[PDB]
Design a protein around this ligand. Structure first.
Ligand SMILES: Nc1ncnc2c1ncn2[C@@H]1O[C@H](COP(=O)(O)OP(=O)(O)O)[C@@H](O)[C@H]1O
Ligand SMILES: Nc1ncnc2c1ncn2[C@@H]1O[C@H](COP(=O)(O)OP(=O)(O)O)[C@@H](O)[C@H]1O
Ligand SMILES: [Mg+2]
Ligand SMILES: [Mg+2]
Ligand SMILES: [Mg+2]
Ligand SMILES: [Mg+2]
Lengths: 348, 348
């Protein structure tokens, strides 16, 4: 479900022609001027995990200099130590996966089947459960009440149209028109369980469901976040429409009714509660990219002190170009670009 | 979704060596001494609709005399006229289906695929949405509060374990181990939509869902039934656990808190509301088999007068051996067994 990033190592990956980075538990701050190669680090981490896509343009990741790339990630998931190695050289691609120090998967395909079964989530759901994009917090606070519920709906992925069963129940149907031309009955038994299923959703019931699965969860965590962040509100409600209702002393309040500082806390609390909800577990690692961008000096300070109260999450990686945030991290990874080649250094 | 039975015709079907029966809209009473061949009529109707099962013992339906059976059903579904013909003679079976007077399906298999797509439900769900077994009402009223919710859960079919995807996502997986031995990528695209789906239920969320889909529905109809049956209660609640709460003047009441007569009304109301819920539409036809069995003279009378108030359902077939119920029907189909052969006659 949720992992711990241990060590990434890249070769000819975009700006990083040769970089090795070790991550620690606690708060990790990847600090470096804009364009220095920070986001590529995690680009490499994600590429290591799900490799290239179908018909993927390998020029995007390979440092323009040559035609060869190699990334090695050491992560741990639910008590196990994994080492994923993904590489590509001149049209030749490969992938290997190790579990507790022994080979587990040796082929690009088997490595994927294994990775997918280790996380228990797909590429996108996993990405939303661990990576918080630049400006999310500021943008959330900018949206109008009705838009806030919108973004929550998105993060959860409510856009689901199981019409795929069309091709599904059919391509796996005709398979029997070749069984009727003078045992294989099982192939019917499941074509039914396909209808019995597609027959209970209708394309519009799948949403009514998700609101049932997530909302409960999100509200649970949102409340825990509140205690961790010391917000003065015993109960936080989350309507089935994703509206945040803070039960204050004199009556329910909406994020918009709160002070700048408290709004930051709630927004962070919500985005975290959602990440936990996507994986149905308390996240082990969360990566925030330039989370204080678009925030005035006041709200930056607030988030800074809130970061300091984050102890419920084992590993929190904050990427920034603001060096003041250095006073919040337990570890500091400086990144400097040297005329096209990134350099990483763990000091400060 | 829901049909109207027009005409059934059987040949060598159990007790009915040769019987032809026409049904009408309104209340139809199939009256006849125990063992006279009433339930076979509808056995034939159901057999006509879904034919024999896989490796089905044709001695059960074929009149013991010989080895040949033939059933022809004329029903209408959602504005269309259908004629289904199912037959079997000496190991040779066949099936034909006509829509609005023209051939539609000519092979046992194509006839099934067509029938299933016309009803929009499987054999069992359809059977619970149209056939109310003997003693259901009396038994329901006999059960203990906690058992009542139990039976509701059953009728809805909450027993669902999508673990079938095991064989599913796998038998349709290895299909690619034969694609990796030096386009067919689509076969992956849907193996994912299979996980993305099986990955959101977990075998225990599918129930939390059904309660969301049905309960709302059942409560809606239960209330309509109340008005049709003239019950003195503006609102009837149906908890997410399937408990019936009658909002009377002095406080909520449970079926058990009501008078014998009112309990019959509620039970009938509930079993009807469920049938509508299974097909997500107001039933067109409902068949009650010996619904007054196990009911004392009082409660029989009550149900009798309630039957008379049933106008919301286009066709209601009541099978019984009690001739007094004849005073409730718009049409009467007498059934007499003549030493092993049933005889049907529409008089009285
Ligand atoms: N394939 C590549 N080869 C060499 N350099 C690349 C390649 N792709 C991107 N870059 C360089 O990476 C730089 C960006 O690093 P950057 O992503 O801005 O780190 P951060 O996100 O922390 O600011 C760009 O300026 C670009 O020139
Ligand atoms: N294959 C068969 N051939 C001839 N008679 C049969 C066959 N199967 C069942 N029967 C007869 O049908 C009779 C039952 O008709 P029945 O179902 O009791 O009508 P109802 O249900 O309205 O009482 C049984 O007594 C049995 O002898
Ligand atoms: Mg960046
Ligand atoms: Mg920042
Ligand atoms: Mg009977
Ligand atoms: Mg009766």
């Amino acid at each position: 479900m949720s992992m711990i990033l241990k060590e990434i190592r890249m070769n000819n990956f975009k700006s990083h022609v040769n970089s090795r980075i070790k991550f620690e538990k606690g708060i990790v701050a990847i600090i470096g001027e804009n364009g220095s190669g920070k986001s590529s680090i995690f680009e490499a981490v994600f590429f290591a995990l799900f490799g290239a896509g179908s018909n993927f343009n390998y020029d995007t990741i390979i440092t323009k200099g040559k035609k060869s790339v190699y990334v090695e990630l050491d992560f741990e998931v639910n008590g196990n130590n994994y080492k994923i190695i993904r590489e590509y050289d001149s049209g030749r691609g490969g992938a290997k996966l190790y579990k507790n120090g022994k080979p587990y998967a040796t082929t690009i395909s088997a490595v994927n089947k294994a990775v997918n079964e280790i996380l228990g989530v797909d590429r996108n759901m996993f990405l939303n459960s661990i990576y918080i994009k630049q400006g999310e917090i500021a943008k959330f606070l900018s949206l109008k009440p009705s838009e806030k519920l919108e973004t929550v709906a998105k993060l959860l992925g409510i856009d689901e149209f199981e019409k795929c069963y069309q091709k599904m129940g059919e391509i796996v149907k005709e398979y029997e028109k070749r069984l009727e031309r003078i045992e294989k009955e099982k192939l019917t038994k499941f074509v039914e369980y396909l209808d019995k299923v597609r027959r209970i959703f209708g394309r519009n019931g799948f949403q009514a469901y998700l609101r049932e699965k997530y909302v409960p969860l999100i509200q649970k965590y949102l409340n825990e976040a509140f205690s961790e962040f010391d917000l003065p509100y015993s109960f936080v409600e989350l309507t089935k429409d994703f509206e945040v209702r803070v039960h204050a002393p004199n009556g329910v309040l909406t994020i918009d009714n709160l002070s700048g500082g408290e709004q930051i806390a709630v927004a962070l609390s919500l985005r975290l509660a959602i990440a936990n909800a996507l994986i149905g577990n308390r996240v082990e690692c969360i990566i925030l990219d330039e989370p204080t961008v678009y925030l005035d000096e006041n709200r930056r300070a607030k988030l800074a002190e809130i970061f300091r109260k984050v102890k419920s999450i084992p590993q929190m990686i904050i990427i920034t170009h603001h060096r003041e945030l250095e006073d919040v991290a337990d570890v500091i990874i400086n990144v400097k670009k040297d005329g096209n080649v990134s350099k990483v250094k763990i000091n400060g």
